[PDB]
Amino acid sequence: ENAEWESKPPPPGWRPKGLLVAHLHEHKSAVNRIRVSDEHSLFATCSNDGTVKIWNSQKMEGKTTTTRSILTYSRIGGRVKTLTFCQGSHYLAIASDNGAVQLLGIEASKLPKSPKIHPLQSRILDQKEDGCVVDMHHFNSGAQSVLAYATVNGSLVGWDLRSSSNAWTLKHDLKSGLITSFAVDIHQCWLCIGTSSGTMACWDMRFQLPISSHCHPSRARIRRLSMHPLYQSWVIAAVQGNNEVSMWDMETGDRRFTLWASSAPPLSELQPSPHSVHGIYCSPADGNPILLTAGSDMKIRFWDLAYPERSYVVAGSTSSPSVSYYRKIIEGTEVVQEIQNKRGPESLPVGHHDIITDVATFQTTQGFIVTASRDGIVKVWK
């Protein structure tokens, strides 16, 4: 009855204008995930360069004398593929494609003293037996501190941090597909696993048994799974191709709402545009949900789910052809289709020039968006 979707929701009627406030290029290669500390004090990025960098969100706000990552960690090795803060800015868990899962203790620092990372319990996964971690979520089960994570060999393991044992393990059916992403219920009742073949499979966490497996009609890879802030039985999937962010009722397996930003006709399984949404941010806001997407086409979109015609592009120069948004009913699913409308030099484009791998938002005084790219560039948008 009293689960909060975010600990710090965006300001009322927040519609990001898209002003670049920090261009941060500090990873050698692609950033894979951005997680924001639950109190929003810090945000962290992981990268193929094998580093974890912690950023002080408080230092992006109007005092950007030196936008530097307060902390860097590089000892895990391999490519750091996922990370998550643990509901309190003291612990950050990271995973590598080598197989290591590490808990990192971030120290709160008074500026006279420097901060640091201290590694805590570390877990190494056998590449043959368990594979590397492909997604990891932390939640507080009151009693426990479960760092749930999914591995290439289909095991979705619930690791209790305040102990060293597993709270649970869920052996995902690899016949379904490779786990690409998974989402956990805010009420900690059920989870959904998204696979590389489009399967999204639900697990009851109270009983710990699988209950549903709906697959995408085109068997398109699931790039992101987010639970719906409003409908407990719904899950938001970001799909391979067409910048498709479809919403699926897990009680029936029906598509309920689709975002289509593609040249292809809506919900068409024929020729998908190469573009996909890699990161999604959904908020209930003031009961009028919004959804921020970014991905392959390097455009940060804002979808007004209550008022689709107000949807717009955040990042991307005005010189690019303007877009319009139309709510339609295709199979019965309502679809917000995006359609293309037929001082010195030009100001430098502030947008990303490579695939935006993830989107995050934090609140310090105002709402900020953080997007990271496949070249290692992290950008903060005021």
Partner 1 sequence: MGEAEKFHYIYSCDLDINVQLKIGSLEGKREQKSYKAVLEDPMLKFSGLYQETCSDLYVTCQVFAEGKPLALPVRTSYKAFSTRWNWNEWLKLPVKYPDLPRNAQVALTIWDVYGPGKAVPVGGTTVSLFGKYGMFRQGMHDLKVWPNVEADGSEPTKTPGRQMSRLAKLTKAHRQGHMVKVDWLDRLTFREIEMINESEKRSSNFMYLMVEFRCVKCDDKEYGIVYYEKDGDESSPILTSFELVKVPDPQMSMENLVESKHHKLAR
Partner 2 sequence: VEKNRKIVAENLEKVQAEAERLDQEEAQYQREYSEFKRQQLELDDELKSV
Answer yes or no: are the C-beta atoms of 202 and 250 closer than 8 Å.
yes
Decide if residue 28 touches partner 2 (CB under 8 A): no
DSSP string covering 294-312: EETT--EEEEESSSGGG-E
The site map against partner 1 for 172-211 (x = CB under 8 A) is: ---------------x-xx-----------x-x-xx-xxx
- Token pair, residue 358, equals 């993830």
**Residue number with CB closer to partner 2 (130 or 254):** 130
Residue 155: CB minimum distance to partner 2, A: 11
Other beta carbons within 10 angstroms of residue 99's beta carbon come to 21
Binding mask 132-171 for partner 2 (x = CB under 8 A): --x-----------------xxx-----------------
Parallel/antiparallel/unpaired status of strands 334-340 and 255-261: parallel
In the list partner 2, partner 1, none, the entry touching 274 (Cβ below 5 to 8 angstroms by class) is: partner 2
- Spell out, one character per residue from 40 to 79, where the chain touches partner 2: x when CB under 8 A holds, - when not: ----------------------------------------
Q: Is 57 helix (H, G, I), strand (E, B) or coil?
A: helix
Buried/exposed code over 132-154 (b: 16+ C-beta within 10 A; e: otherwise): bbbbbbbbeeeebbbbbbbbbbb
Q: What is the DSSP string of 169-197?
A: EEE--TTT--EEEEEE-TTSSEEEEEETT
Cα–Cα separations (whole angstroms), residue 204 to 36, 111, 157, 207, 246: 27, 46, 14, 6, 22
Query: Residue 206 binds what, of partner 2, partner 1, none (CB under 5 to 8 Å, by partner type)?
Result: partner 1
Q: Binding marks (x or -) toward partner 2, 173..202, rule CB under 8 A?
A: -xx-xx-x---------------x------
Binding site for partner 2 (CB under 8 A): 30, 127-128, 131, 134, 152-154, 174-175, 177-178, 180, 196, 221, 274, 296, 354-355, 374-375
